[PDB]
Amino acid sequence: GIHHVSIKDVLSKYVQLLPNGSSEFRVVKEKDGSSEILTENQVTFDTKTTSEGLVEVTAKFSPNYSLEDGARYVLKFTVTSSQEALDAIAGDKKLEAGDAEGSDVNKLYSNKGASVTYSYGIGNSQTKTKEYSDNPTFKPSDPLTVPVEVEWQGVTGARTVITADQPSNVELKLVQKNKNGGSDNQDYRKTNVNVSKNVSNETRNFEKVAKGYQYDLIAPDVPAFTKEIKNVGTESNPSFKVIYKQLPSLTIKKVLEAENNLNKEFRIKVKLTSPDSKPLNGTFGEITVVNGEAEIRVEKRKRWRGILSYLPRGTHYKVEEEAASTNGYHVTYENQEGDLNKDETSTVTNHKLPSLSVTKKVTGKSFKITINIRDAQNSPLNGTYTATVNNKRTPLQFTNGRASIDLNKDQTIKIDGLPLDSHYTVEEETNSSRGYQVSYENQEGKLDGDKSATVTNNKN
Amino acid sequence: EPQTTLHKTITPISGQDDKYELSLDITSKL
Ligand SMILES: [Tb+3]
Ligand SMILES: [Tb+3]
Structure with a gap:
């Protein structure tokens, strides 16, 4: 039989083992239909890093385990695409010579060499190494496409009319957050979304987005609008919505x-x-x-x-x-x-504010007239107002609702700035009236605008 | 020396994104 057997694979930088040897290394002996798993006592597994920083995997058979004649022994374990491969398929890394079959990113080589070492003979046995001639390849999974949606809202919410100026498009950027120290890539992918008056919703997508990273979005500040960005998908399958809501x-x-x-x-x-x-x-x-x-x-x-x-x-x-x-x-x-x-x-x-004018007419000497004003709330007026008799502005003062004025024939006094919706009455003092018949135009009245009252004194 | 044959394949693991099974074998014959 052959003995001292060991099987060796150097993984290329495009794959890697699973956490906690979920990789499930096993060697299976296949003979006459039946499959049997070698035990801890028949084979041991070693992971090491080569000088070039590649991972090497060795299944070392128990040294005095002899391979049964005609039996197929098969080392099996799972690898996963490394970040290198996820980036490569996204288009973010160039292949160098030796990376993939004919530099096709869909045919990355999984191995940088694989071999078996074995001895045969009793006493001083002899040792051979044979390199595996198969150089297998694989395609990483397709990279992500990441949708982005833009919604414009009026002041009062979704699909309400917008009145503010809008720009004719917005530049959105996908940010690939750096994991291994380093800075976020804020220009990882970019798209220009159209903006049309009264089209409230509009969608684009970032193509060829590498898996393995967290993503975020950058969207411009638009004057007159507030901005909300949400990932409406998941961490591993991001999808973004930007909502611009007009400010009041x-x-x-x-x-x-x-x-x-x-x-x-x-x-x-x-x-x-x-x-x-x-x-x-x-x-x-x-x-x-x-x-x-x-x-x-x-x-x-x-x-x-x-x-x-x-x-x-x-x-x-x-x-x-x-x-x-x-x-x-x-x-x-x-x-x-x-x-x-x-x-x-x-x-x-x-x-x-309304005014009151009072006029003296004489038919058929100064004349004293009392003005009574109550304000809108019906409480008697207290205060001083400007009054005018032929361009002479004298202050007129109301005490407890009463003021009194002296008019000659054909004089008008005009009292400005009185309180809106108050009520006046005018009355000639009985001493001024002695000898004359007094009548009135607009003796009482409401100060809802400028008002005029007239006192006419007729001799006899 | 006995004859040995060697075969290495990789297989996509059905229904799983980015997982592959490596298979390295040896057979000895008299
Ligand atoms: Tb100022
Ligand atoms: Tb009355």
Whole structure:
């Protein structure tokens, strides 16, 4: 028989053993149909690293085990594709001479030499080595194709109309995360996805992506939109979705009411605070916000409006007109305060304050007339208002609802800036009236705009 | 010396990605 037998394979760098000898080395003796597994006492397995850093596998038969005549002994074990082969088939490594049959990546050689050593003879036996002449090959599994999808959403979610500018495409990059120290490859594969107005979903795929790595995606920052990237597949079979969701915008509008001067400008402050109770800073369209404060100056030329474009989602707003800008107006607000989770319009209404005019007519000497005014809430007026008698602006003061004025024939006094929706009555004092018949135009009335009352004194 | 024959093959392992069975044999004959 032959003895001192041993079988040797040097694996090429394109394959490798499995963890924990899951590789299951065994030698099977095959003879007359029947298959039998050599025991620990008949064969031993050694893995070693050669000087060139290749893995060598040896099945050493128990030295005095003699091969039974005509029996086929077969070493068997599993290998798996190494990273080298997974990269090679993905196209990421070039083959050198000697790597694969005719440099075909589908026919990588598994071995860098294999042989059997054996002795024969009693006494000083003789030793031969025969190299195996078969040089087998294999194809690694196909590399991955990794889909990527882009979804655009309007402010209020999926398939809602988008109003913001979009670029005409986005460059997406697949990042192969480095495992063995080193840096991530951020340009591993790239694709340009089309972007068309009102096409909300669009797909491409990275081709020829090597298995063995974790992947991530890079997608550009697009102004006016927030960005979410998710792997909707798995670690080993990645598939990515990028969602761009438009950010909300706050429109500040001014409305003039009962105001025939359209050439005034108004200053409107907006206070903007973050969900994390914090200083909001930055520029949103034309408006810069410094430490939560922003100021919008409105006029006819800017269509009585300003827009803070594309504020953080959830931003808290409180709009208020500057004190100076409110003089001469009853100022009311719609949507003054809120949280910005969709587009919002906040409206400042400046309603010009009403005046009262009183006129003395004489038919058929100063005349004293008492004005009584109660405010909208029906409490008597206290305060001083500008009053005009032929271009002479004198202050007129109301105490507890009453003021009193002195008119000559054909004089008008005009009292400005009175409170909106208050009620006046006028009455001549009975001493002024002595001798004359007094009647009134518009003696009582509601200050919902500029009003006129007339006192006519007829002699007799 | 007896005659020896030697055969080495690799086989894809059915239904598994990237696994292959190596088979190195020896037969001795008188
Ligand atoms: Tb300023
Ligand atoms: Tb009355």
